[PDB]
Structure 1
Amino acid sequence: LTDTGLLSGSEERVQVALEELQDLKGVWSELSKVWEQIDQMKEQPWVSVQPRKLRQNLDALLNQLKSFPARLRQYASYEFVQRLLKGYMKINMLVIE
């Protein structure tokens, strides 16, 4: 059979999708790594850790989730990890307040 399965425009689209998916997977991994520390800071009790400790945990989660590349930051994974870390830090700060 005479099939056009070589590196055509479809092949270029497949390669671009694979590169974008690698970037998105990196962003998701960085977001999960940051969100682990962010969730730890958020789940730290108000009596156990003050608002300063909650803010420190949220900032550590944001720093962990902000280490992704440009493609990772374009992907939603790192941004959502940073959002979860910021939410945990805000929960700690509100508990301290």
Structure 2
Amino acid sequence: DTGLLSGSEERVQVALEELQDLKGVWSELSKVWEQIDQMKEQPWVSVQPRKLRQNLDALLNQLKSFPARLRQYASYEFVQRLLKGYMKINMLVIELKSEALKDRHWKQLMKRLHVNWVVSELTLGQIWDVDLQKNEAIVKDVLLV
């Protein structure tokens, strides 16, 4: 018998508590990503921006649902910046719904983003994976012209 390492015990305790915290975080983040992937999978060519704004508000409510313990994490800040870029996606949506969306317009935008697309399925998850925050200049030039 000897003085047991209480450092190991407190390490186990903090590991367990942070593990449960991050498990709740992973549940919330899995819900967030599945919903955003589901909505961005559709072309949303003839779908008003307001039904994506309401999803934005729902994401905000989900981000405010968990206590402040996650709100101090890098994942919370990343999801908040994702929400900011998601209202940027709303900013984009007007171009998606715009009368601008022509075949030659599609080809010029495609050349700007260098990706390859199939017209039948306009899965805008791909157009957002090509980050609009990253390629803002080229898409803005296309929108202006």
TM-score range, shorter chain: 0.5 to 0.7
**Alpha-carbon distance between aligned partners in 2 of 1:82 and 1:29, rounded to the nearest angstrom:** 17
Deviates more, 1:54-63 or 1:85-94: 85-94
Question: 1:54·1:90 contact (CA, 8 Å) conserved in 2?
Answer: no
CA change 1:47–1:40 in 2 (3 A) is: same
Question: 1:58·1:88 contact (CA, 8 Å) conserved in 2?
Answer: yes
Shift of 1:11: 0.8
Q: C-alpha root-mean-square deviation of aligned residues, in Å?
A: 3.6
> If the length of structure 1 is used for normalisation, what is the TM-score?
0.64
CA change 1:79–1:4 in 2 (3 A) is: farther
**Alpha-carbon distance between aligned partners in 1 of 2:78 and 2:3, rounded to the nearest angstrom:** 37
Larger radius of gyration: 2
> If the length of structure 2 is used for normalisation, what is the TM-score?
0.48
Q: How many residues align?
A: 95
Displacement over 6 Å in runs of 4+: none
Using the aligned pairs only, state the percent identity.
Answer: 98
Shift of 1:67: 1.9
CA change 1:4–1:82 in 2 (3 A) is: farther
1:48-95 CA-to-partner distances (Å, cap 9, x unmatched) read 322222222222233234322222223344444454455444324411
Which structure is higher in RCO with an 8 Å CA cutoff and minimum separation 6? Answer: 1
CA change 1:5–1:72 in 2 (3 A) is: farther
Larger helix share, 1 or 2: 1
CA change 1:73–1:27 in 2 (3 A) is: farther
5+ residue gaps, structure 2, are 94-143
